[PDB]
RNA sequence: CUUUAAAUCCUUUAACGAGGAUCCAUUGGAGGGCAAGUCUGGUGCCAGCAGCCGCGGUAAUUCCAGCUCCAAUAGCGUAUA
């Protein structure tokens, strides 16, 4: 129940200067501190475990076993994350998966199918991610349909917050880590796709360092 | 060459995943909330809702300002207004797909009998319909899956042959009266 | 031991215990009512992991 | 697709026909030699009467003997070996008695540790083995 | 260790060919040949040589293939010979372990 | 009473017709896939289970029985195209 911010970003977040996490995503700062997201996203950041599988490295005297835990965390109105940690026991492997998933979290965008009435509910276009041999598609769906997929990307898109999707996977789907990372990579690059809805040139607002350099030279060495 | 019908169809569908936690929890919640018998009823409500959603999607994928689109769209909207799952404010084709199994389940006769105050519980409403006590527009109804229209809501009352709304008393009343006559001599 | 080609030794040596009389089970619509009640109505909030409906440990 | 031309459909159809022919399931299901070598003759069930009761052991990992029965079929006289399904049912079946024999559930192949055999007995003397098991009906004699 | 006796459905046997695939053929006391298939508990721990007295069960539905139960040492074999449960025709021909 | 060529059945309607409302709901399953006991007794690689991995070696969460529980429900399991 304490915090010493070792980085400049942590001090800026703690000193009530940076408003949301959206501008941190906008300038693409590397978030090397876990509890920045804890400070921004509160109790709505619900987590659950995907699979705890064992990996074994054999030695001369028997074989040594380690457990790696795939854990996805995310908020149901946008941001979703995913983290893999391999350690000795299971509980601190779960905690390492929590901290590494809270480190690696990205925002998503939501669009419309056909008609633009109300809140966005589905993915804006056909987006596709790939890791390993696993190829995952995310195709927009009409309103009130629901996610149709395997249960693991289904729960990943529900914790992402999208209500409607169409999916089509290919490859060794049974490897849950590769499938989860492929779905996370597919949903992460929605801000890497250029659309005519935002063809206008973005005004270059300054970095928070450019306005809070006085505060940081007061509070740091 | 006998002259028969030979026309029938299945009104329900079975999901491809038989054993999932969230699905079984959701259908159990629906059944226990609205007092239904088995999962075939909610499966058939899912089937007819999927048919209506498919028809609305097929009309939406056809181009605007065409007579078939307007005819079947206004026919579907007038029908769903007549059921009562929509109001005149949301009289639009794209608003059809934002429906739910809940809106189709509130229009059951059992739900209306429990909601108006004829019965005390939804299961008591079901067994009250099963013993022929509830009539509407001078016709008794013995079935719980009756869809009442919007104009038929205010005609719900007890029957003229049921003892609850005035009529001949039942089997236990006359038997207890005869038992009282035997005890009194 | 006796022999090895004999069949149904376990069935022919099972201690035959007769069934005991129990109250009849509700069926049709009331079983769904009791399952809904016992699974969603009188439950207490619980942390950790949820035990099963037959975890007699 | 490889040969993509606007006036190329016969070549695609003939190549698809040849590559569909050069298969396993389609080649089995569209040739008469498999059904000629099929003892049941492409049917779900078949009748037969009992020659004798024999015994065969299991494979290498599992150590037990499985007590099948030798029944020849009535349609064409093929002598096959059918596995008596459940425990203690070898007393109920007798030599020279009619049985109803069906497959075991792998489209005509051996299942697990039993060797070579692929059929099971369902009914003997026109009464089911389940009724003789659960104490619901008694066989005639 | 202990002096096990036979029962209705089992008899003794003498090995003729020590054969592979977990099977062999041994005579009964009257000379009828039953194809002996060894028991699963006697596959690696104990070893069965040629021309030794063993214990082999029988079948109550056919006579084509039998199963081995147990094996006896040489001293208990000649002790069982001295009682007279077998006729005066069978000779053990001095089988035992070497040194 | 009605129907019908004459009936039967449906509907209407008498008199009777329930408290363990005995007027008593089965079919499969309980290691994973796949929802649900490391419960209690018997056999001990035997008998057997298991579509697939596999379970049985005198402490069987899988065999055989009692209780509890899970699935669909007047329906459920199995073999074949």
mmCIF file of C-alpha atoms in Angstrom, chain A residues 7-185:
data_model
loop_
_atom_site.group_PDB
_atom_site.id
_atom_site.type_symbol
_atom_site.label_atom_id
_atom_site.label_comp_id
_atom_site.label_asym_id
_atom_site.label_seq_id
_atom_site.Cartn_x
_atom_site.Cartn_y
_atom_site.Cartn_z
ATOM 1 C CA UNK A 7 10.509 6.961 -13.432
ATOM 2 C CA UNK A 8 9.533 10.397 -14.712
ATOM 3 C CA UNK A 9 6.204 9.057 -16.017
ATOM 4 C CA UNK A 10 5.332 7.707 -12.570
ATOM 5 C CA UNK A 11 6.009 11.070 -10.928
ATOM 6 C CA UNK A 12 3.932 12.838 -13.597
ATOM 7 C CA UNK A 13 1.032 10.415 -13.070
ATOM 8 C CA UNK A 14 1.239 10.664 -9.264
ATOM 9 C CA UNK A 15 1.443 14.483 -9.164
ATOM 10 C CA UNK A 16 -2.048 14.892 -10.791
ATOM 11 C CA UNK A 17 -0.742 16.379 -14.056
ATOM 12 C CA UNK A 18 -1.416 13.801 -16.796
ATOM 13 C CA UNK A 19 -5.185 13.533 -17.157
ATOM 14 C CA UNK A 20 -5.865 10.156 -18.789
ATOM 15 C CA UNK A 21 -3.863 7.334 -20.338
ATOM 16 C CA UNK A 22 -5.049 8.286 -23.847
ATOM 17 C CA UNK A 23 -2.310 10.868 -24.437
ATOM 18 C CA UNK A 24 0.293 8.399 -23.118
ATOM 19 C CA UNK A 25 -0.998 6.037 -25.805
ATOM 20 C CA UNK A 26 -0.998 8.934 -28.288
ATOM 21 C CA UNK A 27 2.682 9.801 -27.896
ATOM 22 C CA UNK A 28 3.479 6.058 -27.404
ATOM 23 C CA UNK A 29 5.514 6.264 -24.210
ATOM 24 C CA UNK A 30 6.890 2.926 -22.934
ATOM 25 C CA UNK A 31 4.988 2.281 -19.705
ATOM 26 C CA UNK A 32 7.662 0.585 -17.592
ATOM 27 C CA UNK A 33 5.591 0.885 -14.393
ATOM 28 C CA UNK A 34 2.728 -1.511 -13.685
ATOM 29 C CA UNK A 35 0.558 0.523 -11.299
ATOM 30 C CA UNK A 36 0.073 3.484 -13.654
ATOM 31 C CA UNK A 37 -2.771 1.433 -15.151
ATOM 32 C CA UNK A 38 -3.914 0.540 -11.606
ATOM 33 C CA UNK A 39 -4.069 4.265 -10.794
ATOM 34 C CA UNK A 40 -5.937 5.049 -14.025
ATOM 35 C CA UNK A 41 -8.188 1.985 -14.385
ATOM 36 C CA UNK A 42 -9.677 1.109 -11.006
ATOM 37 C CA UNK A 43 -11.817 -1.851 -9.936
ATOM 38 C CA UNK A 44 -13.231 -2.318 -13.469
ATOM 39 C CA UNK A 45 -10.007 -4.079 -14.583
ATOM 40 C CA UNK A 46 -11.149 -7.685 -14.152
ATOM 41 C CA UNK A 47 -8.685 -10.555 -14.599
ATOM 42 C CA UNK A 48 -8.923 -14.302 -15.096
ATOM 43 C CA UNK A 49 -6.493 -17.108 -15.913
ATOM 44 C CA UNK A 50 -6.479 -18.896 -19.283
ATOM 45 C CA UNK A 51 -4.245 -21.958 -18.813
ATOM 46 C CA UNK A 52 -1.446 -22.959 -16.433
ATOM 47 C CA UNK A 53 0.710 -25.446 -18.320
ATOM 48 C CA UNK A 54 4.009 -27.014 -17.183
ATOM 49 C CA UNK A 55 7.288 -26.881 -19.084
ATOM 50 C CA UNK A 56 10.193 -29.159 -18.200
ATOM 51 C CA UNK A 57 13.947 -28.810 -18.645
ATOM 52 C CA UNK A 58 15.705 -32.065 -17.824
ATOM 53 C CA UNK A 59 18.979 -32.153 -15.886
ATOM 54 C CA UNK A 60 21.419 -34.921 -14.960
ATOM 55 C CA UNK A 61 19.583 -35.715 -11.696
ATOM 56 C CA UNK A 62 15.967 -35.932 -12.815
ATOM 57 C CA UNK A 63 14.008 -33.247 -14.632
ATOM 58 C CA UNK A 64 13.234 -29.737 -13.386
ATOM 59 C CA UNK A 65 9.675 -28.492 -13.913
ATOM 60 C CA UNK A 66 8.364 -24.930 -14.211
ATOM 61 C CA UNK A 67 4.814 -23.627 -14.578
ATOM 62 C CA UNK A 68 3.902 -20.793 -16.951
ATOM 63 C CA UNK A 69 0.547 -19.025 -16.640
ATOM 64 C CA UNK A 70 -1.308 -17.280 -19.465
ATOM 65 C CA UNK A 71 -3.414 -14.494 -17.938
ATOM 66 C CA UNK A 72 -5.471 -11.893 -19.803
ATOM 67 C CA UNK A 73 -6.608 -8.725 -18.021
ATOM 68 C CA UNK A 74 -8.644 -5.880 -19.461
ATOM 69 C CA UNK A 75 -11.429 -3.370 -19.008
ATOM 70 C CA UNK A 76 -14.822 -4.064 -20.624
ATOM 71 C CA UNK A 77 -15.000 -0.586 -22.318
ATOM 72 C CA UNK A 78 -11.832 -0.549 -24.384
ATOM 73 C CA UNK A 79 -8.402 -1.595 -23.139
ATOM 74 C CA UNK A 80 -7.281 -5.233 -23.041
ATOM 75 C CA UNK A 81 -3.974 -6.841 -22.108
ATOM 76 C CA UNK A 82 -2.214 -10.190 -22.037
ATOM 77 C CA UNK A 83 0.791 -11.510 -20.146
ATOM 78 C CA UNK A 84 2.856 -14.702 -19.868
ATOM 79 C CA UNK A 85 5.226 -15.404 -16.964
ATOM 80 C CA UNK A 86 7.138 -18.615 -16.213
ATOM 81 C CA UNK A 87 8.409 -19.121 -12.658
ATOM 82 C CA UNK A 88 9.007 -21.897 -10.129
ATOM 83 C CA UNK A 89 5.680 -22.218 -8.301
ATOM 84 C CA UNK A 90 2.178 -21.315 -9.505
ATOM 85 C CA UNK A 91 1.072 -18.393 -7.305
ATOM 86 C CA UNK A 92 3.992 -16.082 -8.068
ATOM 87 C CA UNK A 93 3.709 -17.187 -11.709
ATOM 88 C CA UNK A 94 0.117 -15.907 -11.615
ATOM 89 C CA UNK A 95 1.290 -12.653 -9.987
ATOM 90 C CA UNK A 96 4.019 -12.285 -12.618
ATOM 91 C CA UNK A 97 1.416 -12.845 -15.324
ATOM 92 C CA UNK A 98 -0.712 -10.113 -13.692
ATOM 93 C CA UNK A 99 2.164 -7.615 -13.619
ATOM 94 C CA UNK A 100 3.357 -8.415 -17.158
ATOM 95 C CA UNK A 101 -0.204 -8.260 -18.511
ATOM 96 C CA UNK A 102 -0.769 -4.916 -16.796
ATOM 97 C CA UNK A 103 2.473 -3.699 -18.381
ATOM 98 C CA UNK A 104 1.350 -4.736 -21.889
ATOM 99 C CA UNK A 105 -2.101 -3.191 -22.386
ATOM 100 C CA UNK A 106 -3.382 -1.474 -25.545
ATOM 101 C CA UNK A 107 -6.573 0.419 -26.479
ATOM 102 C CA UNK A 108 -8.993 -0.796 -29.135
ATOM 103 C CA UNK A 109 -11.403 1.002 -31.446
ATOM 104 C CA UNK A 110 -14.977 -0.015 -32.216
ATOM 105 C CA UNK A 111 -16.977 0.725 -35.348
ATOM 106 C CA UNK A 112 -20.288 -0.026 -37.053
ATOM 107 C CA UNK A 113 -21.750 -2.562 -39.464
ATOM 108 C CA UNK A 114 -23.457 -0.705 -42.298
ATOM 109 C CA UNK A 115 -25.264 2.009 -40.340
ATOM 110 C CA UNK A 116 -23.945 4.493 -37.756
ATOM 111 C CA UNK A 117 -26.614 4.771 -35.041
ATOM 112 C CA UNK A 118 -25.785 4.707 -31.342
ATOM 113 C CA UNK A 119 -22.650 3.507 -29.621
ATOM 114 C CA UNK A 120 -20.073 1.497 -31.599
ATOM 115 C CA UNK A 121 -20.400 -2.249 -31.087
ATOM 116 C CA UNK A 122 -18.122 -4.127 -33.532
ATOM 117 C CA UNK A 123 -14.665 -3.891 -35.131
ATOM 118 C CA UNK A 124 -14.383 -1.172 -37.823
ATOM 119 C CA UNK A 125 -12.974 -3.383 -40.604
ATOM 120 C CA UNK A 126 -11.380 -6.761 -41.352
ATOM 121 C CA UNK A 127 -8.278 -6.926 -39.155
ATOM 122 C CA UNK A 128 -5.909 -9.895 -38.974
ATOM 123 C CA UNK A 129 -3.038 -10.916 -36.715
ATOM 124 C CA UNK A 130 -0.452 -13.669 -36.898
ATOM 125 C CA UNK A 131 2.025 -15.310 -34.549
ATOM 126 C CA UNK A 132 3.379 -18.818 -34.913
ATOM 127 C CA UNK A 133 1.276 -20.621 -37.504
ATOM 128 C CA UNK A 134 -1.971 -19.226 -36.064
ATOM 129 C CA UNK A 135 -3.919 -16.817 -38.278
ATOM 130 C CA UNK A 136 -6.916 -15.062 -36.713
ATOM 131 C CA UNK A 137 -9.462 -12.838 -38.473
ATOM 132 C CA UNK A 138 -11.812 -10.308 -36.878
ATOM 133 C CA UNK A 139 -14.736 -9.421 -39.144
ATOM 134 C CA UNK A 140 -17.520 -6.930 -38.261
ATOM 135 C CA UNK A 141 -20.975 -8.262 -37.397
ATOM 136 C CA UNK A 142 -24.446 -6.676 -37.242
ATOM 137 C CA UNK A 143 -25.934 -5.436 -33.991
ATOM 138 C CA UNK A 144 -27.137 -7.987 -31.454
ATOM 139 C CA UNK A 145 -25.378 -11.003 -32.987
ATOM 140 C CA UNK A 146 -22.649 -11.864 -30.478
ATOM 141 C CA UNK A 147 -19.112 -13.204 -30.708
ATOM 142 C CA UNK A 148 -18.774 -16.540 -32.509
ATOM 143 C CA UNK A 149 -15.326 -18.128 -32.008
ATOM 144 C CA UNK A 150 -13.497 -20.536 -29.743
ATOM 145 C CA UNK A 151 -14.094 -19.794 -26.014
ATOM 146 C CA UNK A 152 -10.617 -18.279 -25.415
ATOM 147 C CA UNK A 153 -10.846 -15.487 -28.072
ATOM 148 C CA UNK A 154 -14.525 -15.133 -27.126
ATOM 149 C CA UNK A 155 -13.586 -14.258 -23.552
ATOM 150 C CA UNK A 156 -10.705 -12.121 -24.866
ATOM 151 C CA UNK A 157 -13.062 -9.989 -26.973
ATOM 152 C CA UNK A 158 -15.616 -9.818 -24.142
ATOM 153 C CA UNK A 159 -12.953 -8.406 -21.809
ATOM 154 C CA UNK A 160 -11.983 -6.176 -24.734
ATOM 155 C CA UNK A 161 -15.586 -4.941 -24.688
ATOM 156 C CA UNK A 162 -16.729 -5.699 -28.244
ATOM 157 C CA UNK A 163 -20.232 -7.159 -28.481
ATOM 158 C CA UNK A 164 -20.254 -8.494 -32.067
ATOM 159 C CA UNK A 165 -17.574 -10.303 -34.087
ATOM 160 C CA UNK A 166 -17.081 -12.834 -36.872
ATOM 161 C CA UNK A 167 -13.970 -15.019 -36.660
ATOM 162 C CA UNK A 168 -12.104 -17.589 -38.750
ATOM 163 C CA UNK A 169 -8.963 -19.261 -37.386
ATOM 164 C CA UNK A 170 -6.323 -21.385 -39.107
ATOM 165 C CA UNK A 171 -3.374 -23.441 -37.891
ATOM 166 C CA UNK A 172 -2.475 -25.308 -34.720
ATOM 167 C CA UNK A 173 -5.317 -23.725 -32.781
ATOM 168 C CA UNK A 174 -4.893 -26.044 -29.760
ATOM 169 C CA UNK A 175 -1.778 -24.139 -28.626
ATOM 170 C CA UNK A 176 -3.620 -21.686 -26.389
ATOM 171 C CA UNK A 177 -0.705 -19.292 -25.884
ATOM 172 C CA UNK A 178 -0.131 -18.820 -29.614
ATOM 173 C CA UNK A 179 -3.883 -18.498 -30.249
ATOM 174 C CA UNK A 180 -4.290 -15.923 -27.455
ATOM 175 C CA UNK A 181 -1.274 -13.906 -28.614
ATOM 176 C CA UNK A 182 -2.526 -14.046 -32.217
ATOM 177 C CA UNK A 183 -5.961 -12.749 -31.177
ATOM 178 C CA UNK A 184 -4.331 -10.048 -29.023
ATOM 179 C CA UNK A 185 -2.094 -9.041 -31.944
#
